[PDB]
Design a binder for this molecule. Structure first.
Ligand code: 700
Ligand code: 700
Ligand code: PLP
Ligand code: PLP
Ligand code: NBG
Ligand code: NBG
Ligand code: CFF
Ligand code: CFF
Ligand code: CFF
Lengths: 793, 795
């Protein structure tokens, strides 16, 4: 707890746990010794917390997700346990630099983006609020791949994150479980029997989730695939890899459905294990016995990925626990709650019934029965409307039959929510109209949030300290306290101190940029940042057009006053996403021309931030002046990066989409740079018909950019390299890039104006930060606790 | 002894809490085991760091035992004993209200070996550490060791030995020493020399396991390498294909004394060799180093031919990497390497097809050719005429598909070659490699195998170790020859009663195991007749089987005739692809089922096929053995070591004058062992003449019956011709002349029975074996290797 004792513990671990001394100890060794030293501080409360849940039996919440974008654990753990300052001092006294040791830790990147990071922020919040929550996922041997740029292109490298070992995970062999696949169904007189199946074992690994300063430590249980133990002998042993390939790697797709059998196996794998583990726990507690199940258990479905949980639970209740269908179904609906995270057609999960029949025979039967009972009702309430039956069916018939997992989640759940007002609204009245009309009270909204511990206290200590010195540390657990910040809007000194914090973050992050990339950084320039997964809907392309735009204006009139900028664009593209990869090449091509043109000089620098991940977001976010949140209105369910930048002192330029809409409401629309078409404008443009060749014909600045991109100005060695981009823009652009081009650029010009007025710029910054309270994930979970899970802190 | 138990207790509770995240209410037995292991493990650290730091500071010559196998067994008790902590830990576990025996059984055996070869490496490590030698073991960290064997419907069934599933607290990853290993690619001959390009790369991640000397503060290292894919069409598939590179250290080839020319196997051999040589070279350069002193600082023992590629690999490093001239490098090489021949069985000789090698290790095939060219140029110069000698001495075999004779490469590439027992070393030197020793006489030597007295006496038989200690002191633990002092008790009946009692307690404890694992009811007063080793035709478990049946037919002949009761135990694993071995298992289990259930035989005889024979089990049945079966055909067992364990543990041996049996006889007196059957010369004479198994069948009533019973379905009614392959082998393809030794073997057994009815004489003979086993301590073997091969002294 104190410095002297932390030094002894560190040396004790370096010695007994790493078998090293100071002369032969590696940096990794020091990091592991520090990690173990901090890890020991959690054990007492972790056992105590789990024991408490058993003795008092509070209702349990289970967040079931295929993704958990956790990032690094060491610093986070030191902050939530109140050890950082002590450890920093101890390490320094041992002659080491804690910051260097921290960089050794590999990110636990078992997610793709928002969906996976949301889940991670939720666990932190649930632990901070003292809830009996458990996160359940898959312990991927490989998480989201590590990204590199070779010759301007994204190159993928396996993210072998467990290679050197993971001190934050705890194998729980006594809770191992078998998961079945294939086989056939047998309807006997003693119940239905799913037999002749292939078995794969699931070994759970527990990771502690410490709440912020509250003595609570929950658990994140991730499952690992293992071959059972019961032709060529060698091949047979090697073939054990097949089963174990189930939890081998995370599918690297963000907002896109890939119907691969292996993925279907991962979905069921995590689902079968989790539900059996929850049932066992339930039956092992202080408890026909199952009638109290929904009062003791709440399972949240993170998107439709774990949709199979609905029939799996039914399978268990009926075939194993011998409950009648009617009862089983009732308990199921009371147990599950579904969160819809997207409206993009390509992201919708539709599994071919053929694939499901072969792999999960008993589950196909259960899904069919669920649909029968479901459609019999509709037929009753609407004897005529037969087209309504087709639109609400769990099965799609057009061509090869498929299963609409989202429909399956709606009927098997008692609550369904979008992740932002505009998204939830679209989900309730448009996408699932036929369902909400019958069950209105079933649909809700639960606007996303981000944890102020990792995304403020951890990533920007300077800002957390400044805020804390002015209004106390109360805000860490109740972010709505940041509103008190309005009391200092005319405080010139607090405004200079606010600016100093940002500048320090920029100077430090600049050192990172000149170290990782050649480029020379103008530390006074404006840090224009857009970091997120590469997507056509997110429009990194639109941003790219503006950069080329600024570049030409500079070449055109070199002597014309230009507010300097450092444009940073980063994010991974799904491996099979061709257009995303091309977009990356374009950006890298532009930067090369821009960063090396003598006429532009320190006026404009462009950086493609490589390997964007949680630990990297913690560095660049505190260093940002301008946050790009420019996806086409109605395409971004919510967004969370936007919230991160808001809490850390950046201004936002974006469209009225996702949570951007709610940010404007909290801070006031004038304090954000909103632009472009809105949900209604995009629809009108659709009914009419989007003809992109019109804006190109009516906007010279855009035409120059387009011609340069099309004629090879950015790829001399390959004149037609960006042909596919141009082709999509002129004939296949569902995200209407050309349509928001003019408004975007004019918006960008106003940002530049404001940037030249420090007093005005920071004043707005302060109103934003003051208005960010709403976006703490503690508030999100609070609403989940009260309106869906019915549990208390 | 004060404050030692209390601190062990505190520490134990500290680990259960911080290391296992458990309290006394939720802890599993496995958690208690891991808690004790970490508690014991902490006592190795100080000495391990200190030991290795010392070898760095004093720079003694280092010995490197390179092997594809290390059959280590359990580490817990062994570590406690060598560190002098068993008594204190036993007491700490007890006071904590726990059953220490229950905890130790939790530990998984590190069975990274097939049999005696892998176990010898293990024993050698323990001894080298006990003698304080700067020794290092080098092998592969298999994810799956030798398979767990189960008996289903009388047949052997193999189950994957997933020994790392729950974690191994005894290994320590050393990531900073990872290394790249190359495969495939091609050879480019440029002006900058020869270059091996276009290669596929695999990484080698070493894992160090501490090897504690006995009561001397020395803690050596065993470094095992694990294969990992390097970080650098379809994304998901590409990531899944990383399993291919990792398959190289996935599982141990389960073959004992048998060459299987598989590509994966060749990859394992090169893998451990390339990782090891690079690491050894890196250590040399990091010490007070150009390479002229290498052979004076480095000695690498090649355990059999499996790591043969180490020779051309060192040449490759020396010439292609270090740029040394060929002549100089070849010189450094021979001085560095030493080869130990572990077998003369033709089916066990590694002969790789030149094509497989060219495709996988092209640069190495060129180097092997060049060594052969030089080598043969020498023969030619010494014997201008004799062209046949070239053919018999070449590393390349031409007949049909060209293959590489790895034995020959090891010989020319080494300064010393040895066998593992007088008779085998003589065979190697004068017959198999006759043309070679004639040129270099001094090169060939002998190094009689040994076993470590710590695991095979102190640990597995605490009763006998204490008995002996109360009579002649503890000195014998560090010098086994001190066992001859037991002779003073040749007349003391009191002592003989005590010796019989210890043996009795072991049989009673082991009987509990048997009846709990098998339906059979044991007669604790019966003679424990045991044959536990890998199932082989040359080891002749059949012969033994022919005796059990011969006996069965005798009891059914006169149910009232005095019969010396026996509990016959035959165990061992069969290589998955070894058809005849599996047939022999099915024949032994079938016979057993007929003898164990025959009402007329009752408590006179019981057959038990001991399932899953392995180091931990060996430690169980060995101390409980009365008679040891070591009956391999003369000239087939290069040495054997089981024989040694049994001898040291109070059992009498019935066997042929093969391997180390000859030397056991010389040491204890040929009449203090039941020797029988043909001898090497008798075997040769029978070969020259011609073996006609049918004659002995024709001339031996008791035998003819046993056979007719096997061939007609007496032991397999549902399947009358089930044992056809066995009958057909015994009659027209028996290279191990089973029947030829059947008559001698049966008469020999009757005498064993006779002697057993006489407690006083039986135990007297036993005492004579225990007092003469000192020569078979691996500490003696290692000392001899050190003086005459490695040229090093006890650091
Ligand atoms: O594995 C040991 N410590 C552990 C310490 C550790 C634990 C968890 C995460 C990181 C480090 C170790 O070095 N690793 C576990 C990792 C893996 O799974 O590969 C790497 C260890 C200490 C020790 C001390 C003695 Cl005397 C003998 C064997 C020993 N092993
Ligand atoms: O893994 C931990 N201890 C280790 C302890 C251990 C180490 C070596 C062999 C057996 C046990 C552990 O339980 N295992 C390593 C094995 C594996 O890799 O499967 C199983 C551990 C302790 C701990 C304490 C906190 Cl607060 C959080 C996470 C934690 N993990
Ligand atoms: C927060 C975060 C995201 C989510 O970003 P959006 O802009 O909301 O899409 C994605 N990736 C990482 C690494 C993050 O930290
Ligand atoms: C000693 C030992 C061997 C050796 O068997 P022999 O053929 O008797 O030399 C094989 N397996 C195990 C488990 C051993 O302990
Ligand atoms: C399928 C998917 O990854 N959806 C993503 O979910 C997160 C968390 O709700 C949203 O912020 C984001 O806008 C959306 O694209
Ligand atoms: C190739 C091989 O496994 N050889 C085996 O080695 C051991 C240890 O040297 C000998 O005792 C045994 O007789 C022999 O069969
Ligand atoms: C988002 N996304 C992908 O992630 C993707 C894709 N095609 C392949 N992938 C992987 N498409 C068309 C797409 O929009
Ligand atoms: C690496 N890479 C790509 O990833 C790529 C490409 N063209 C299209 N793509 C997606 N080219 C030319 C290329 O070198
Ligand atoms: C020892 N041995 C084997 O181990 C073996 C074999 N055939 C296959 N195997 C595996 N043969 C004929 C054999 O003698």
């Amino acid at each position: 707890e104190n410095v002297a004792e932390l030094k002894k513990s560190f040396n004790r671990h370096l010695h007994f746990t790493l078998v090293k001394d100071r002369n032969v100890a590696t940096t990794r060794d020091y990091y592991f010794a520090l990690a173990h030293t901090v890890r020991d501080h959690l054990v007492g409360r972790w056992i105590r917390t789990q024991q408490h849940y058993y003795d008092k039996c509070p209702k349990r919440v289970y967040y079931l997700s295929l993704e958990f974008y956790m990032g690094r654990t060491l610093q986070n753990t030191m902050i939530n346990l109140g050890l950082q300052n002590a450890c920093d001092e101890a390490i320094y006294q041992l002659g080491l630099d804690i910051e260097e040791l921290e960089e050794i830790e590999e990110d636990a990147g078992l997610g793709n983006g928002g969906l996976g990071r949301l889940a991670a922020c939720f666990l932190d919040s649930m632990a901070t609020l003292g809830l009996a929550a458990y996160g359940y996922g898959i312990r991927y041997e490989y998480g989201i791949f590590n990204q590199k740029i070779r010759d301007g292109w994204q190159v993928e490298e396996a993210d072998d994150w467990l290679r050197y070992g993971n001190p934050w995970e705890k194998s729980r062999p006594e809770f191992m479980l078998p998961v079945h696949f294939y086989g056939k169904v047998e309807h006997t007189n003693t119940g239905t029997k799913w037999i002749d199946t292939q078995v794969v074992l699931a070994l759970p690994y527990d990771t502690p989730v410490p709440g912020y300063m509250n003595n609570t430590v929950n658990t994140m249980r991730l499952w690992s695939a293992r071959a059972p133990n019961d032709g060529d002998y060698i091949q047979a042993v090697l073939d054990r890899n097949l089963a174990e390939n189930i939890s081998r790697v995370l599918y690297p797709n963000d907002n896109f459905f890939e119907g691969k059998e292996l993925r279907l196996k991962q979905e069921y794998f995590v689902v079968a294990a989790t539900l059996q583990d929850i049932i066992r726990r339930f039956k092992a507690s202080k408890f026909t016995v199952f009638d109290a199940f929904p009062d003791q258990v709440a399972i949240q479905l993170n998107d439709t990925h774990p949709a199979l949980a609905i029939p799996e639970l039914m399978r268990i209740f009926v075939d194993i626990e011998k409950l009648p269908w009617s009862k089983a179904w009732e308990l199921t609906q009371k147990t599950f709650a579904y969160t819809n995270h997207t409206v993009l057609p390509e992201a919708l999960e539709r599994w071919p019934v053929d694939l499901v029949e072969k792999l999960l025979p008993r589950h196909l039967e259960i899904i069919y029965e669920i649909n029968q009972k479901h459609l019999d009702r509709i037929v009753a309430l609407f004897p005529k409307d037969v087209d309504r039956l087709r639109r609400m069916s769990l099965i799609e018939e057009e061509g090869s039959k498929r299963i609409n997992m989202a429909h399956l989640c709606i009927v098997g759940s008692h609550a369904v929510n979008g992740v932002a007002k505009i998204h939830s609204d679209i989900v309730k009245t448009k996408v699932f109209k036929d369902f909400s009309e019958l069950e209105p009270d079933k649909f809700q909204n639960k606007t996303n949030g981000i944890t102020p511990r990792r995304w403020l206290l951890l990533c920007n200590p300077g800002l957390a300290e400044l805020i804390a010195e002015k209004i106390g540390e109360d805000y860490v657990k109740d972010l709505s306290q940041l509103t008190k910040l309005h009391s200092f809007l005319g405080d010139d000194v607090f405004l200079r101190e606010l600016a100093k914090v940002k500048q320090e973050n920029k100077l430090k992050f600049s050192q990172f940029l000149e170290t990782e990339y050649k480029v020379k950084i103008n530390p006074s320039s404006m840090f224009d940042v857009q970091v997120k997964r590469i997507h056509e809907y997110k429009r990194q392309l639109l941003n790219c057009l503006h950069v080329i735009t600024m570049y030409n204006r500079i070449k055109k009139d070199p002597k014309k006053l230009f507010v300097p900028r450092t444009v940073i664009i980063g994010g991974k593209a799904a491996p099979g996403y061709h257009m995303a990869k091309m977009i990356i090449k374009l950006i890298t091509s532009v930067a090369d021309v821009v960063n090396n043109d003598p006429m532009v000089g320190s006026k404009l620098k462009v950086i493609f931030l490589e390997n964007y991940r949680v630990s990297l977001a913690e560095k660049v976010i505190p260093a940002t002046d301008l946050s790009e949140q420019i996806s086409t209105a109605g395409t971004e369910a919510s967004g969370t990066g936007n919230m991160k930048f808001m809490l850390n002192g950046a201004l936002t330029i974006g469209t009225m989409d996702g949570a951007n809409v709610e940010m404007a409401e909290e801070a006031g629309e004038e304090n954000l740079f909103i632009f472009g078409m809105r949900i209604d404008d995009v629809a009108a443009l659709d009914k009419k018909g989007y003809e992109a060749k019109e804006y190109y014909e009516a906007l010279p600045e855009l035409k120059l950019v387009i011609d340069q991109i099309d004629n090879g100005f950015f790829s001399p060695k390959q004149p037609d390299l960006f042909k596919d981009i141009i082709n999509m823009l002129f004939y296949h652009d569902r995200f209407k890039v050309f349509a928001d081009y003019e408004a975007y650029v004019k918006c960008q010009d106003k940002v530049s104006q404001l940037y030249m007025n420090p007093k005005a710029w920071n004043t707005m910054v302060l109103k934003n930060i003051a208005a960010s309270g709403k976006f703490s994930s503690d508030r999100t979970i609070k609403e989940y606790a009260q309106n869906i899970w019915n549990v208390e802190p």
